[PDB]
Design an enzyme around this catalytic site. Structure first.
Site, short mmCIF file in Angstrom:
data_model
loop_
_atom_site.label_atom_id
_atom_site.label_comp_id
_atom_site.label_asym_id
_atom_site.label_seq_id
_atom_site.Cartn_x
_atom_site.Cartn_y
_atom_site.Cartn_z
N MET A 132 71.79 56.79 33.35
CA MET A 132 71.80 57.79 32.23
C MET A 132 71.71 59.22 32.79
O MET A 132 71.22 60.13 32.11
CB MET A 132 70.61 57.41 31.30
N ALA B 270 70.30 62.37 35.27
CA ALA B 270 68.97 62.81 35.71
C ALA B 270 68.57 62.06 36.98
O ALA B 270 67.52 61.36 37.01
CB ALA B 270 67.95 62.50 34.62
N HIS C 212 67.35 60.59 40.40
CA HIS C 212 66.35 60.77 41.46
C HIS C 212 66.46 59.70 42.57
O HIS C 212 67.36 58.88 42.57
CB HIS C 212 64.98 60.75 40.78
N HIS D 50 67.44 56.16 41.67
CA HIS D 50 68.91 55.94 41.48
C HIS D 50 69.61 55.90 42.85
O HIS D 50 70.55 55.12 43.05
CB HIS D 50 69.51 57.01 40.67
N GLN E 153 71.03 52.73 22.28
CA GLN E 153 69.85 52.11 22.90
C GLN E 153 68.64 52.95 22.56
O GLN E 153 67.50 52.58 22.86
CB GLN E 153 70.00 51.94 24.39
N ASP F 173 73.46 68.91 38.88
CA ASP F 173 72.68 68.32 39.95
C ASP F 173 73.17 66.91 40.24
O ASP F 173 73.23 66.53 41.42
CB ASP F 173 71.17 68.27 39.63
N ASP F 174 73.49 66.14 39.19
CA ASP F 174 73.79 64.72 39.40
C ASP F 174 74.98 64.57 40.30
O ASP F 174 74.91 63.82 41.32
CB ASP F 174 73.98 63.95 38.06
N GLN G 195 74.32 65.52 44.02
CA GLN G 195 73.65 64.41 44.70
C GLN G 195 74.60 63.29 45.02
O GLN G 195 74.52 62.68 46.10
CB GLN G 195 72.55 63.82 43.82
N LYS H 262 62.55 48.09 38.54
CA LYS H 262 61.59 48.82 37.73
C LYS H 262 61.67 48.42 36.23
O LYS H 262 60.67 48.21 35.51
CB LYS H 262 61.83 50.33 37.88
N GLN I 192 64.97 44.58 31.40
CA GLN I 192 66.40 44.95 31.26
C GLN I 192 67.24 44.16 32.31
O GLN I 192 68.31 43.67 31.97
CB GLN I 192 66.50 46.43 31.56
N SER J 72 60.75 57.84 38.15
CA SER J 72 61.32 57.66 36.81
C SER J 72 61.64 59.05 36.32
O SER J 72 60.87 59.99 36.62
CB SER J 72 60.28 57.04 35.85
N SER J 73 62.78 59.20 35.62
CA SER J 73 63.11 60.55 35.09
C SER J 73 61.99 60.96 34.14
O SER J 73 61.69 62.14 34.01
CB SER J 73 64.48 60.54 34.38
N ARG J 74 61.32 59.99 33.52
CA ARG J 74 60.25 60.38 32.57
C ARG J 74 58.98 60.96 33.24
O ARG J 74 58.16 61.61 32.56
CB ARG J 74 59.86 59.27 31.63
#
Ligand SMILES: Nc1ncnc2c1ncn2[C@@H]1O[C@H](COP(=O)(O)OP(=O)(O)OP(=O)(O)O)[C@@H](O)[C@H]1O
Ligand SMILES: Nc1ncnc2c1ncn2[C@@H]1O[C@H](COP(=O)(O)OP(=O)(O)OP(=O)(O)O)[C@@H](O)[C@H]1O
Ligand SMILES: CN(C)S(=O)(=O)c1ccsc1
Ligand SMILES: CN(C)S(=O)(=O)c1ccsc1
Ligand SMILES: CN(C)S(=O)(=O)c1ccsc1
Ligand SMILES: [Mg+2]
Ligand SMILES: [Mg+2]
Lengths: 272, 286
Positions: free
Chosen positions: B37, B39, B41, B44, B69, B85-86, B89, B157, B161, B193-195
């Site tokens: 999705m 973001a 890090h 990923h 979702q 940024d994505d 990277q 993680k 899923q 986690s992006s969160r």
């Protein structure tokens, strides 16, 4: 190692991985894989799907035979020159039972989805599995089950499936009755009255120069002239089974019960 | 359309990436898919690196945030969205294909045919969000059909899923190998986690208790399942401002089977408004 495949003979596979391996290997040698899904008990209506798949150049034809939870079928396929029959057991198809499934859109609740509201979730689930097992270039369905065919086109579009869906015109008995394995149950009086479905649809398609209400009233008059024909619906829709546009192309669909036997038919309608 | 090898090629149209993937496979490259999705890090990047190492690989990383979702209000508008940024990277990692479709190209007919997951989707993360995994599996099936990878990569993680995607692949006879990649963690154990960006410094300090609870339970588990669970609970109970949503020890397939020797221990907890998940392999009596 790829399972055995003998060009020009009927090769029967029951294991999904086998037909999958053969079909991948065949596609790599430049055959175009055609899939014709059936529930067996083959008749001329099914063989017209087969003949359609056969005339694609470079085709190898896969006919699946599967009932959602025989020798003569296979002979018919041989006589047609089909090279692959895929005949899985329920357990091979559902080894983990009923778990992930396809949920159709709201069209599956209408028309045939009235009496049978989970019928098409079941059909789309097995269609999607067959497409993934066989990975055909084209998959063939009869126009007789028009709503089923439109639902399959939605499955394909919606899940970005790379297969061409080919709808094959309905094969009919000499008086117009759409062929179906159910016809055999009709007694003589029911068989004589069953002609009204096709006669009503054809009358409507010619009357449609006079407009959509003339087409519907002509169809209803014909069904009204038949005894013992309990109409479940008679509906004119656009060709994707949305609401019928003011003019242009549509589809007229009918389903009726004669005794315990449910019959379906439908026809292309050009309005005005 | 065009594909410049050894460079990052970005496609938005599904037909474009399907065409390029198909051409690439035909020439014998093996197509690896890493759905994200955005973001991005280092978690990923572990998926990307696993994909890269498959010999002959070409790596497709997709970046796509639903309207399926997510389940209102609310959340969909809250998702970190830095496409910039994505891509940088990804260029850095030597990925050759980014797939960044529009919501319109993915849902031209709204939600019409969708995937109905099995009963696992109603539990754990699905308890309060009983449509969440139908959203995820519907997108993952479409991504798998558009890109037709040989292998698709997901992190451990989001263990539930991962299991659901294995169920989808089995149950629909999908011809792709699903590769689970181990969870990448900060130096103190916190799962990336992006969160995690929504944790203030105190909440970031407290959040170590998830991973500490799990690794304490994994070690405690020589003494049995009850010991392991009580060790995790005690650590989480000692953590200021961690509010536990669930802590559950299941069989590895999370499935309708009692726990034997091997398990997964799963936790979800809120630190203020941020919900964090983590999980760990558990061996009972080992
Ligand atoms: N008369 C027909 N003309 C064209 N296609 C047909 C005909 N009858 C069946 N088919 C097509 O054959 C495929 C397999 O159909 P299925 O195996 O249910 O047989 P069916 O004759 O519709 O049998 P039933 O009467 O039990 O419903 C489907 O695509 C169906 O639309
Ligand atoms: N720390 C991690 N280690 C390994 N894989 C990870 C990690 N974090 C996320 N992933 C995986 O990356 C893929 C893309 O996940 P997604 O883009 O939701 O990122 P996320 O970091 O989980 O974001 P959020 O925190 O918003 O849920 C998923 O397969 C997910 O399991
Ligand atoms: C549409 N059918 C003829 S099928 O082979 O995909 C099927 C559907 C339910 S049982 C067999
Ligand atoms: C008795 N049926 C044959 S019928 O001829 O009365 C009939 C069939 C379609 S309309 C009237
Ligand atoms: C599991 N995801 C990262 S995905 O790319 O399949 C997805 C699912 C909903 S939005 C993106
Ligand atoms: Mg039928
Ligand atoms: Mg996540």
């Amino acid at each position: 190692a790829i399972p055995a495949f003998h060009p020009g003979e009927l090769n029967v596979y029951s294991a999904p991985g086998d037909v999958a391996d053969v079909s991948r290997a065949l596609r790599l040698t430049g055959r175009r894989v055609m899939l014709v899904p059936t529930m067996g008990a083959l008749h001329e209506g099914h063989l017209a799907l087969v003949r359609a798949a056969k005339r694609v150049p470079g085709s190898v034809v896969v006919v699946s035979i599967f009932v959602n939870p025989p020798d003569d079928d296979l002979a018919q396929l041989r006589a047609e020159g089909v090279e692959i029959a895929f005949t899985p057991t329920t357990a091979a198809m559902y080894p983990d039972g009923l778990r992930t499934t396809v949920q159709p859109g709201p069209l599956a609740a209408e028309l045939e989805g009235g009496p049978r509201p989970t019928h098409f979730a079941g059909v789309l689930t097995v269609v999607l599995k067959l497409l993934q097992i066989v990975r055909p270039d084209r998959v063939f369905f009869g126009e007789k089950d028009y709503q089923q065919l439109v639902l399959i086109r939605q499955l394909v579009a919606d899940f970005n499936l790379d297969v061409a869906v080919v709808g094959v015109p309905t094969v009919r008995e000499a008086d117009g009755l759409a062929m179906s394995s159910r016809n055999r149950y009709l007694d003589p009086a029911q068989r004589a009255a069953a002609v009204a479905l096709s006669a009503a649809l054809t009358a409507a398609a010619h009357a449609a120069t006079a407009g959509a209400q003339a087409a519907l009233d002509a169809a209803r008059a014909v069904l009204d002239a038949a005894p013992g024909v309990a109409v479940d619906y008679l509906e004119l829709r656009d060709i994707g089974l949305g609401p019928m546009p003011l003019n242009g192309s549509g589809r007229l669909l009918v389903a009726a019960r004669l005794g315990t036997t449910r019959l379906l038919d439908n026809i292309a309608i050009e309005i005005g």
